[PDB]
Amino acid sequence: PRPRLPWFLRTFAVPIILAWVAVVAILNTV
Amino acid sequence: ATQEEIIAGLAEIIEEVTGIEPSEVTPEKSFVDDLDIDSLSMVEIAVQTEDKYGVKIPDEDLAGLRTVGDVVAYIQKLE
Amino acid sequence: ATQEEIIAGLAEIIEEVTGIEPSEVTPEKSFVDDLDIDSLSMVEIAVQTEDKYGVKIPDEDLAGLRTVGDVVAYIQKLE
Amino acid sequence: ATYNDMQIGADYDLIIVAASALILIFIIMMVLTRAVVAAAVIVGTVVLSLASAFGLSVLLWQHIVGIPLHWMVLPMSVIVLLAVGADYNLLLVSRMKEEIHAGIRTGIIRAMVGTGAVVTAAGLVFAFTMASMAVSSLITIGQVGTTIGLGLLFDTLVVRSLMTPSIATLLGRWFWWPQRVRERPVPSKWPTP
Amino acid sequence: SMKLIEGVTFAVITVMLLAVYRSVITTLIVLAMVVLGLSGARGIVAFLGFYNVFGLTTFATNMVVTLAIAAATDYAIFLIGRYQEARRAGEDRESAYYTMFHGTAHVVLASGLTIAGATLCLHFTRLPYFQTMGVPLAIGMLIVVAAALTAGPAVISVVSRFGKTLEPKRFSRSPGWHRVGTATVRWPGAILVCAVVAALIGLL
Ligand SMILES: CC(C)(COP(=O)(O)O)[C@@H](O)C(=O)NCCC(=O)NCCS
Ligand SMILES: CC(C)(COP(=O)(O)O)[C@@H](O)C(=O)NCCC(=O)NCCS
Numbered sequence A: 001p002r003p004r005l006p007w008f009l010r011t012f013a014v015p016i017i018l019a020w021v022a023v024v025a026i027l028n029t030v
Numbered sequence B, C: 001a002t003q004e005e006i007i008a009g010l011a012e013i014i015e016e017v018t019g020i021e022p023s024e025v026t027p028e029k030s031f032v033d034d035l036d037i038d039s040l041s042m043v044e045i046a047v048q049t050e051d052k053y054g055v056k057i058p059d060e061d062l063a064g065l066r067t068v069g070d071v072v073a074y075i076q077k078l079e
Numbered sequence D: 001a002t003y004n005d006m007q008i009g010a011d012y013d014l015i016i017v018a019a020s021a022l023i024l025i026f027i028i029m030m031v032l033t034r035a036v037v038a039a040a041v042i043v044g045t046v047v048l049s050l051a052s053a054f055g056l057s058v059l060l061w062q063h064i065v066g067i068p069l070h071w072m073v074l075p076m077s078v079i080v081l082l083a084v085g086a087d088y089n090l091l092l093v094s095r096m097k098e099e100i101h102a103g104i105r106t107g108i109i110r111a112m113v114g115t116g117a118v119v120t121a122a123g124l125v126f127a128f129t130m131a132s133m134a135v136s137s138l139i140t141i142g143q144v145g146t147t148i149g150l151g152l153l154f155d156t157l158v159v160r161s162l163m164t165p166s167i168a169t170l171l172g173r174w175f176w177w178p179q180r181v182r183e184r185p186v187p188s189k190w191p192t193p
Numbered sequence E: 001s002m003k004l005i006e007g008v009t010f011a012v013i014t015v016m017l018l019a020v021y022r023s024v025i026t027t028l029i030v031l032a033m034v035v036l037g038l039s040g041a042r043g044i045v046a047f048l049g050f051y052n053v054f055g056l057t058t059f060a061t062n063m064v065v066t067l068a069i070a071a072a073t074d075y076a077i078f079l080i081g082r083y084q085e086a087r088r089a090g091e092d093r094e095s096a097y098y099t100m101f102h103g104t105a106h107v108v109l110a111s112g113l114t115i116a117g118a119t120l121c122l123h124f125t126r127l128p129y130f131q132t133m134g135v136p137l138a139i140g141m142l143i144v145v146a147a148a149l150t151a152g153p154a155v156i157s158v159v160s161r162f163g164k165t166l167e168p169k170r171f172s173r174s175p176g177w178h179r180v181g182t183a184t185v186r187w188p189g190a191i192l193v194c195a196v197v198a199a200l201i202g203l204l
Helices: A002-013 A013-029 B003-017 B039-053 B059-064 B067-077 C004-015 C039-053 C059-064 C067-076 D002-033 D036-065 D073-102 D103-135 D141-174 E003-021 E025-050 E056-089 E092-124 E127-159 E175-184 E188-203
Strands: none
Touching: A002 A013, A002 E092, A002 E127, A013 E025, A013 E127, B003 B039, B003 D036, B003 E025, B039 B059, B039 E175, B059 C004, B067 E127, C004 C039, C004 C067, C039 C059, C059 D073, D002 D036, D036 D073, D036 E092, D036 E188, D073 D103, D073 D141, D073 E056, D073 E092, D103 D141, D103 E003, D103 E056, D103 E175, D141 E175, D141 E188, E003 E025, E003 E056, E025 E056, E025 E127, E056 E092, E056 E127, E092 E127, E175 E188
8 A cells, every 4th residue: 555656756766866867967067 | 310310401401502392302312413413502511511510521522422321421420 | 450550551651751671660660770760751751641541640749759669559549 | 325225125125025924934834734823833933033043143243243234134034044944843843743643742742752853953954054154255145144044043942942842732732723632632541461 | 255155065064964874875875965956956047047037146046055955955864864763663664764755745845845935935025136036046946845855765765775774873762852842741831931031032
């Protein structure tokens, strides 16, 4: 009965971290 | 105190507060449905009971009580 | 209430408050020395006891109590 | 004349900012905690702390350093102080509501013993981060940072520690109006060993 | 002076985190979260201001940097603190993580929304500095909140899996907090009077 949102965060952690890193890098480089 | 005396006193108080005749008031009746008595009328009954006989019923207890006999049992418990 | 039940409840409360395991808590133990419990921890125990079982202990009474069995006797005295 | 206009605008904007911030924060707190009285208590405690924060900053700069506060420091300090104090009180109240099913007083004690260290660490970090702006060559920025730091220090060390739990203890069941809360649970029988 | 401010703030934060968590790796992780949040807020503010969406001053930029750093650190502290409380209570890492999210997700989001909305009240001012300080601060705070609420749980998920990284180090109670709570509960009147008197000192 795990809640959906924390489970989603826990499962796809690496893609989320990489997405945040890429977005921040683009915004601070362009 | 005997159940009959308590029921008679509660019947008088209820009749004064809401208008339900004493005969309709029986220990198995429910305030919410059988007697259709809201919470405010119930606290009015509690205030009358405290000021007349000294039996004190807090609001939290008033929440729990459902039937007339349930109230009588609570009063007997205090005794 | 029997002494065993009161001692068990007090042991649970003390374990929550200070950290003393229930087995070490025996009626002859002294809070100040045997259990090394300060006055503030004692009033914490009193608050827990009041909020869980309804037994009320004023600060003046808390001053007098020295051993665990002494507290139990006080609770039995109220009964 | 330019600076006269600046001063008038500063007073007007200060009043507007204070009112709007109070209203919005009160609304958010009432929505989240589902209780009016809790939000009112939080707002009042934060404002009372804000007054003392203003006093401390005024002393430390004007009397000790000698440089009076710049005319634009006040609203910038006020808004941040209100927001952060409200957030800390909100965290404490939320933990209290979580732990209150075991009685008001035990719930308060457990909520304090739980949150206290974390909230203290966060408050000290925020205060020392704000106070670190004094290294700026510009002194208005340093004044703003130090004022916010002093406010956060006083709030964390007084309002959270004492004022909010004391008011909660005093108000009792009224603290969570309109939600119905038992002051103490049903007195249980002693456990059977 | 902005750059020196940033450096000093980072040094102070590192020292305080080392003092509190009594470990180096946890401090590094919190610093990584802080860097991510600060960089996100600074980047978005600079990018929007560049294309003439709004004007910027020195005050707005300094406040953006400092507030973003502080908010990121506070959110990381909240999450890790609740997670460690659950972990020390006895729960395993999975249940402790879920308990942490359940008990702190709403608090962090509410705090962030309060901070963001508070600065948005500046947009209704008159003086140009106050009016220009409104929107960028709100946008930066929103970016910081999003980063804390998404990356925070994600990093906690990944890090805790590997080794004994986020486990508590100082397994201890809070006897001082117990005493203070007892004093507050037993005698609220005197403590409230003392607090009110202390607060009124600032009116002099
Ligand atoms: C008053 C009442 C018994 C009404 O209950 P009901 O909604 O079941 O009629 C219940 O809401 C309650 O105890 N509320 C808390 C105290 C309160 O509301 N007092 C009146 C405010 S003026
Ligand atoms: C509080 C206490 C039980 C502490 O006793 P101890 O010094 O033996 O621990 C005792 O000093 C006492 O009753 N003091 C009077 C009331 C009081 O001090 N309240 C706290 C002031 S905030």
